[PDB]
Design a protein around this ligand. Structure first.
Ligand SMILES: Nc1ncnc2c1ncn2[C@@H]1O[C@H](COP(=O)(O)OP(=O)(O)NP(=O)(O)O)[C@@H](O)[C@H]1O
Ligand SMILES: Nc1ncnc2c1ncn2[C@@H]1O[C@H](COP(=O)(O)OP(=O)(O)NP(=O)(O)O)[C@@H](O)[C@H]1O
Ligand SMILES: [Mg+2]
Ligand SMILES: [Mg+2]
Lengths: 455, 461
């Protein structure tokens, strides 16, 4: 007889740790270092703070291969009343708002905690001091998986009285440093290369210490929360926006105030194409009317593109500097495209190419993938970036031999990167995105085409 | 200004449909068919029913490219009170119990429903009649994303026939998904000869796959965990569900497979536990000790093979010859192992020569719990194992050979890299055993290649 039952989000991720990037101990250690750094980076640069990040991994029990991972930053900290949920409630996040951040699911650190609890008994350690008080708060936490609720083991505060803002997070998990070493090193290195306004220090399990000096005090304009762009907004997104209304807006008012690129004239144009009326209440839209708005948004040709205030790019200058410094080529070029939209979300594709000097000779190009400023390291052959690069024909951008020295770099940034898995290692096959990645690559391929014709 | 918010699982997957295999209309159309057929096969063969499944896909709007997908089966049906939750609440399932089934997440049809609701008007329609039912129950439902609970829009009953019909309308891309949907159906048919399928596609083509045998494999059942790899939280769950107030010793022999009286005694001393202490009092620290012992113990018996459902060496070689028409084929059905407390078996087969096209790499056919895997092969651990093996060592000569390699992984839990279930993650115990299985069947290929040459050498000399 079939027995029907329900799972809490925590039970789900605990039954299937692989879903979140925790298939084996090696990937687990890498994933944990990743999640913590991306969390400190979001707590600092998204708020205009020059990042100061400390990463340490120590071997604590050699027989059971448990490593302690500690990441300390100078970010904004977390309000005391939010700490148990932030670190101990699966699907809880300050990044569900429409804004470009490394994080997006409200899961990563909880996934690390769940994996921690299933293999050892030490609670995760959190010390934080938000941008204000005289207090530093310490917490020790466990997740109650059946209920998906935090359990506060330890809780305390002291007086700091200095000017210490930031967060320290320490998790203990099974790991395999030998198997994770190179990837962990590459991850931090590829992050450093595109984050010159940040300082990092990394001490590995064997005591090797690496310092990555800040090179500039110039911090890019922090991304902000923005309204969705109408193009691609779906039926359920629309009704979620409707229910979250605190008045009884008309359709026209709803259009002009809830979306980017819609002003009076666009709104009127939208209404006519959609066969709706300016002054009706949006709360009374039928299921079918909603369908009409959505299709009308898809087929509308005159939408002003999304602002850039929601996005934060690396920039043509830095991408270039970066390629030259790592590969020392004869030629390098890059492009930062104008903002587009897919499924309501603004995005930008940037691309870079490098073709000479110290670049190894190969049959295929070296592909460097980035997403929302995160270096992608695993599963390259599953990524759309790889698919598009593969599909490009270089025999007509200059590369004559079937053997060449090229480095291709693609960065995708959006208020939503569509990963193939919650472990965030590869980008899914989304049409508007493949299309715009191909457009970015072609811009740089042409810049190369000229060179190879010039040289 | 950080603002903290929580999300329900429905809103989670609605925001990231990609995570469940709905990245684009083509993949969406393919994923809906697959999820429906898999639910239908789980509803029939797992219950000793010879599956009779009819699949239709109709275009209902050329402009908007909306397709209606209908899968009809003669399975056990669904108790009416469970329908709303079964189709309308994310993380609701009858397959969380420890048993080999195609389904495992409690998410499959809900992902298609969310996708369907984001893009189109018509609610999912479910008609079902449970076993020993004089009524056929019909529902039309939606999901309340924000709350993650079903919304019943229509519900009715009529007088008396058993099984279920599910119909869902979604955006699709027939011309891009076509060849993959056909391959999915044909590949499942070949390893499922006790099933009968009818498939009608959006162009009006009809394909009939007749039942070739009335013999059905013995249904997989719910079993006890095997101790190797059971984790701390799973121990806590087992302890929490106990009806009797067992001692630790009684806990070990009664809750696990492969643990008898002596094995228990051996395990308790290895872990510093008193046989007679009540389990309900185990301390966090003792749970760590137990788990670590389980993980280190080298004398555990193999999991019951009776707990899984295998394709079998005959069907594998049989299906391989049928499809490729090679000169040679071999397969091995390996003995059960265990990973993270779950029983598993790897089956492997190899076919060489004949109609197999020539290439530089082997053709790689993956299946998991009897489901053919068709996307993301290069992200799969099977693909990884196959690419690491030096085939030059099992007889292959040139850089362009005619070879098909087939790997089947079955278990109470398949560790997929994504809720879309298209590739299997890098789990070590699994990666190691697939290697070993491949090697076993590769030895066989060696024997064939060097029995062929010695024949080519006799004729020449
Ligand atoms: N170092 C930190 N400083 C300040 N806030 C933090 C820090 N780490 C985590 N948080 C807060 O805790 C929340 C949960 O983290 P997390 O579980 O990793 O989810 P997420 O980062 O929001 N998204 P994702 O990582 O993609 O699953 C974040 O949204 C932050 O608001
Ligand atoms: N055709 C069917 N016949 C009988 N029961 C069904 C059928 N379709 C769905 N169910 C039931 O509904 C539940 C939910 O289905 P589903 O949402 O697909 O999740 P799942 O099949 O359990 N696992 P997964 O598909 O991997 O997410 C199943 O577990 C079955 O109990
Ligand atoms: Mg995070
Ligand atoms: Mg299912």
């Amino acid at each position: 007889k079939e027995k029907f039952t329900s799972l809490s989000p925590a039970e789900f991720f605990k039954r299937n740790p692989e879903l979140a990037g925790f298939p084996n101990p090696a990937r687990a250690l890498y994933q944990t270092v990743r999640e913590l750094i991306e969390n400190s980076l979001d707590a600092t640069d998204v708020h205009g703070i020059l990042p100061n990040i400390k990463i340490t991994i120590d071997l604590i029990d050699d027989a059971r291969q448990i490593y302690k991972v500690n990441v300390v930053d100078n970010g904004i900290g977390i309000p005391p009343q939010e700490v148990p949920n932030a670190f101990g409630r699966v699907l809880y996040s300050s990044k569900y708002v429409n804004r470009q951040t490394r994080g997006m699911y409200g899961l990563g650190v909880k996934a690390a905690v769940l994996y921690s609890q299933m293999h050892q008994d030490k609670p995760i350690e959190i010390e934080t001091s938000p941008v204000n008080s005289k207090r530093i708060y310490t917490f020790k936490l466990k997740i109650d998986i059946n209920k998906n609720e935090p359990i506060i083991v330890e809780r305390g505060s002291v007086e700091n009285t200095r000017g210490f803002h930031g967060t320290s997070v320490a998790i203990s998990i099974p790991g395999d440093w030998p198997k994770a070493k190179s990837r962990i090193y590459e991850y931090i290195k590829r992050t450093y290369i595109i984050t010159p306004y940040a300082e990092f220090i990394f001490k590995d399990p064997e005591g090797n210490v690496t310092y990555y000096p800040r090179l500039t005090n110039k911090i890019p304009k922090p991304p902000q929360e923005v309204k969705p762009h109408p193009y691609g907004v779906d039926r359920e997104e629309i009704k979620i926006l409707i229910n979250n209304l605190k008045r009884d807006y008309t359709i026209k008012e709803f259009l002009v105030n809830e979306f980017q690129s819609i002003g009076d004239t666009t709104a009127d144009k939208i209404l006519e194409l959609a066969g709706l009326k300016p002054n009706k209440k949006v709360k009374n839209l039928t299921e079918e009317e909603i369908t009409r708005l959505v299709e009308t948004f898809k087929k509308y040709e005159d939408f002003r593109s999304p602002s850039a205030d929601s996005l934060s790019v690396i920039g043509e200058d830095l991408i270039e500097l970066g390629l030259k410094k790592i590969f020392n080529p004869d030629f390098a070029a890059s492009i930062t495209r104008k903002p587009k939209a897919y499924q309501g979300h603004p995005f930008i594709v940037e691309a870079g190419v490098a073709f000479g000097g110290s670049i190894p000779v190969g049959e295929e190009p070296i592909v460097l993938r980035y997403a929302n400023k995160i270096p992608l390291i695993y599963d390259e052959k599953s990524d759309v970036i790889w698919k598009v690069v593969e599909e490009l024909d270089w025999k007509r951008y200059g590369i004559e031999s079937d053997q060449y020295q090229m480095v291709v770099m693609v960065h995708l940034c959006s208020t939503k990167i569509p990963y193939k898995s919650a472990g965030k290692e590869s980008i899914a096959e989304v049409e508007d995105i493949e299309k715009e990645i191909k457009n970015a690559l072609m811009e740089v391929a042409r810049k190369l085409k000229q060179y190879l014709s010039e040289k």
